[PDB]
């Protein structure tokens, strides 16, 4: 009798399989706003010009493809460090961190979680309701327990602050608590730099231990901007983890560019806890993927290479803050009676159209457009060309 | 109290803690045969050529970085399943087995683990005693009970068939069994075909899941002569599972390219269990990375770059197996008394020499000569410029 005969089959992944049901429609009007991926304004998805130079000169200069260390590239993870903790911070010069190139932001997830269900007694981690789909997943498949806490306000487009302190209430001492950096997946709203302070303080009181999902550093308001929750729990707290993503703000997702930051409160005890997330690491995918992380270091070891990329990523955060003020106007000239005022306010990719599952659905169906079940819509999926015909087919479901 | 004071340290790598004290040894002449990668006459780790031409073509005609699906590209999984089952296999044409992209044939392990544990009612691996460490760690990660079958004749430096079927006498029904599909790690003794033949039958007998690891495919014979033993397995199963890499026989050590593949008794249950598959992967590190597996296919689905490739791969195989035979005749005339013939007979890049743990030791800290605890010598490190020195080195030893 076989092995695999009463396999039960997986449901389809919300986000991930949109992707595969837009791929086979086949009507030429088609619209994706699922995937999280960023458009220009001719609608394809570019490589970066900094990442096509990083690229040329990895060609003419790699002499070898030897494994690279568990943690990867030295000087990838030095750059990591500046970006989410400043150039001359604390936990740097008194070596309290240390980092390790994963394949991804998800990769970066998953090795924490085997990290802390292997080594330490966490058993639960509070995940924001909503919040972005797999990081259910990933925790669940490490061992862990996942709670929700309060987060958004549907009814005012706004971040519910007292509900979510009174949710996190119940977050015992030694609990991991999941605080997305910027960008908030998928309300779009993050807290203000006095609510960071209020959680930071609140975080070391009840003894949480913080863990930063990190994935879009710079499509708030700037790469020092959205740190700043991030450098205000670390000017507080002994301990705390950061897996941030180089996908977005880069776009290289297909070469997996991820990083899982651990911080203790000495230089000891952050080499004897990193030595079992390297062996957490072994027993994975045993060394990350080089490409990837080789053109990140290029391009942030480089003045002038950096300065290339860090124009690319004002340009892309700016054009977005374009179809998210030209989504609301459109809007309104095409009939539409409802208030998309809050959508100005949201940072990132994304935002909360408050579209219900049958609205969605019926926008896919009848119109070929697509997004997520929840309502999550990509505005940087946005172009002039394609914002009235997708204006028009919301308006019709309204 | 801080979540990481009570954290234990975990002890380095026995095959990457290796290259750390090699990086730091400052003895004029020290000799590298420790981690599994391959050098040229020179000494250095070079990159195929039609990789460099391959990596040039990708440069030129790529024009997004977008997200692969979980399981990755499908050119990569349709050259993959040809390699290991033949160009006109009945698996392929019954559309009995999917492949998914992983990173590294390590990736392609923990899938598997990850996907047996959840899964199935699976609870025991049989790995091979020696065999390569980290098979253990990957099982182990996701909560499988890991047991040891016998394997090598210590004594006569050949495989100890009785003692292997006799001690895989206890393995259940629904076990998996890994075998590795050639060059045996670290031995370099494999199956004959009529010990394959031999296991085949026992294998459907006795109700074993087997599990192919195939690291060295084209290092023994050739990249269809080291496919026999799978292929008789694969005549005979309904389902079974391979765990490929790309690491060794392209070069391609740190970009991180494998393959898993499933195959079960029909097309409708590999597609069910194919889907729970690719959740584990959604879980663990989302999609993986391109680069490295667009180079592997742009070079098999192309005469040209394969014809160039499959020569690469022979002129590895064809130092190697020159370096084994210097390696016995110089030892000779350093003047061995013990006879190191049995060097020959080994198939791969390592030889395991039947050093003690006391002697590496010995070799490293007394020569500056690295290699595994184990006695696992590198034999795709020697060289003609260091055999002398190395061989001097173990005759002192001896
Ligand atoms: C909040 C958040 N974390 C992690 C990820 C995963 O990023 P990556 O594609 O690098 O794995 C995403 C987006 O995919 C995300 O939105
Ligand atoms: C038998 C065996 N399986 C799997 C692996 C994993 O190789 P990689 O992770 O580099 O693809 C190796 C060597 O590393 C090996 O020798």
């Known amino acids: 009798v076989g092995t695999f005969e009463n396999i039960t089959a997986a449901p389809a992944d919300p986000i991930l399989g949109l992707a595969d049901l ?58 990591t ?17 240390r980092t390790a190139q994963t394949p991804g932001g998800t990769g970066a997830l998953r090795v924490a979680a085997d990290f802390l269900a292997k080594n330490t007694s966490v058993k639960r981690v509070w995940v924001s309701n909503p919040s972005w789909p797999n990081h259910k997943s990933v925790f669940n498949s490490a061992g862990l327990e996942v709670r929700e806490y309060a987060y958004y306000d549907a009814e005012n487009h706004t971040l519910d602050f007292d509900a979510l302190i009174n949710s996190l209430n119940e977050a015992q001492a030694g609990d991991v608590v999941l605080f997305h950096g910027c960008c908030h997946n998928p309300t779009g709203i993050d807290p203000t730099l006095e609510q960071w302070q209020t959680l930071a303080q609140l975080s070391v009181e ?8 990190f994935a879009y550093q710079g499509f708030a308001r700037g790469l020092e ?11 507080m707290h002994k301990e705390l983890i950061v897996a941030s993503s180089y996908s977005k703000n880069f776009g ?13 409160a000495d ?7 990193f030595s079992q997330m390297k062996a957490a690491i072994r027993a994975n995918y045993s060394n990350p993927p080089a490409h990837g992380a080789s053109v990140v270091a290029t391009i942030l070891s480089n003045d002038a290479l950096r300065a290339i990329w ?12 374009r179809m998210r003020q030209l989504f609301v ?27 219900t599952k049958e609205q969605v659905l019926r926008l896919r169906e009848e119109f070929g457009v697509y997004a997520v079940a929840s309502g999550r819509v990509n505005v940087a999926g946005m172009t002039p060309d394609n914002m009235a015909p997708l204006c028009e087919a919301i308006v019709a479901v309204l």
Chains 1, 2 share one sequence.
């Open 22 to 79: 837009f791929r086979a429609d086949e009507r030429p009007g088609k619209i994706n706003l699922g995937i999280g991926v960023y458009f220009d304004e001719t609608g394809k998805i570019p490589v970066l010009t900094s990442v096509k130079k990083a690229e040329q000169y990895l060609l003419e200069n790699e002499t070898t493809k030897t494994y690279l260390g568990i943690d990867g590239i030295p000087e990838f993870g030095r750059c």
């Open 81 to 97: 460090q500046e970006l989410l903790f400043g150039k001359g911070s604390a936990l740097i010069n008194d070596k309290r961190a």
């Open 206 to 213: 009840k003894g949480w231990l913080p863990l930063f999902d």
């Open 225 to 235: 901007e959205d740190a700043e929750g991030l450098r205000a729990f670390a000017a």
């Open 252 to 264: 290289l997702y297909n070469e997996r560019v991820g990083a899982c930051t651990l911080v203790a």
């Open 267 to 273: 230089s000891e005890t952050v080499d004897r806890a």
């Open 310 to 321: 860090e124009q690319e990523l004002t340009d892309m955060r700016q054009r977005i803050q």
């Open 329 to 355: 106007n459109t809007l309104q000239e095409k009939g539409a009676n409802r208030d998309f005022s809050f959508i100005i306010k949201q940072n990132g990719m994304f935002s909360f159209s408050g579209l």
